[PDB]
Every structure is written in C-alpha cells, then in structure tokens.
C-alpha cells in the first residue's frame, strides 16, 4: 500500500531507422544516433487540438546505439538519464523514470547527422498507421493502476540527405567535346541506395558522360549523405562529400 500518486514505469521506446531501406542502419556516413526527441507531460487530459500553451514538464532525449544479445545494434531513445540531453528532472520511483496520470506528447526536434526532419514518421508495427508530427497519448486509470495508452514501441523513419555532383575533363573544345565517362564510387562504411540499388564501399554506384558543353552531371538526389570518389572511366581521382540536401557539388573549376 503506497503513499504516492498513481504512476507507470511502462513508457515508450523509439527506434531510429533509415526511411528508404527501413533498416536499423544509416546510409553513407550518416548517423541514426544523435536524433533528438522533445517529450512533454501535461497534468490534464488533452488531445492534439486542445493542448495548453505550457507543459507541466519537458524533456529532450537522444538516440544512442545499443547492441542486443543477438548482436543487433539499434538506435534507441526513451525517458531515462542515459538518453537525456536537456530539460526538467524526471519523476523517479524505485530508480526508474515514471509518469503520473495525464497527457504525453513526443516529436523528433533534431534529425540525426546526415538526415532530414522533413517527412519523418513513427510506426508501432508493420502496415500500421504512419504518425507524422506530434504523437499524443495519455496515462489513464485502469482499476488501481496508471497505464500508458497505445503502443510502448515505435520505429522512427528518417529521410537521408541526398545530393549530386558535376565535373569536366582535365584547338577549342578539343577537351570538352570528347566523350569523357566518370565512375562515381562509394567510400562509405554503410550501404548507399542509388537508383533503386544498394552499393557497398569501393563499388561503382553510377557512370556519367560529358554533355556538348563538356559537363557530366547527376540529378540532385542521386547520392545519400556520404563520401564518394569520382574518376575518369578509362586518371587522377577526386574524393568529395555529399552534405547539403539537393545541392550539386561543383567539381568543374
């Protein structure tokens, strides 16, 4: 027979994954670790449409890599000290973070390095509803207990940053009018999805040819955040990075 308000330690675990591959691994040299989530607890019972302007407590947590007993690394965040970035103190009971009756909201507020926030969504299981933006649930009474409504686990899908690259070969037009082919190679420790196909380190992900101006170019979404090597396909190679979304890296000097 306790003497403290009704609370539950059964909260929510978020698993960060790559949206395009649906894998527990980042693409290129991006990360699934470091994604930040803002959690807000409210003393009342609200829905998304009538949340008060001020939360009762606010916490910012981040995804951290964890390898399970099967040897699989996941990128997990939840309401505990090991995942905390900033915010108020947690409600603690018997060495664990708990929540009293009320409303709980959570949304991704910082994409992990190499990813975008744009379009990120949560999923409780396979085929279930894709939740975009702010997720809202409550801690409600069930007999003498406090219970969190809805799923206890979600996958959080993040869109990887993508970019492109353009280049030239090194009379008049005797160099630019030649048919110069360039191979683009992955220098990444993780797979890269390029034109519907997965490529590993040192594999050629694309070949591009020079136009009548002498410029070989890719689309602005060909390559995920990552390190790449561009070399004439016959030969002095160039290493470059994709970091800004939709930007064509300019190697034409």
Author numbering: 292 to 461, 470 to 533, 543 to 561
The article reads:
Clostridioides difficile causes life-threatening gastrointestinal infections. Herein, we report 30 X-ray structures from a structure genomics pipeline spanning 13 years, representing 10.2% of the X-ray structures for this important pathogen. The Center for Structural Biology of Infectious Diseases (CSBID, formerly the Center for Structural Genomics of Infectious Diseases) implemented a structural biology pipeline starting in 2010 through paired efforts with systems biology, bioinformatics, and other research specialists in C. difficile pathogenesis. This project ultimately involved 335 proteins linked with pathogenesis, metabolism, and antimicrobial resistance.
The structures presented here are part of the C. difficile 630, R20291, and Y384 sets nominated at CSBID.
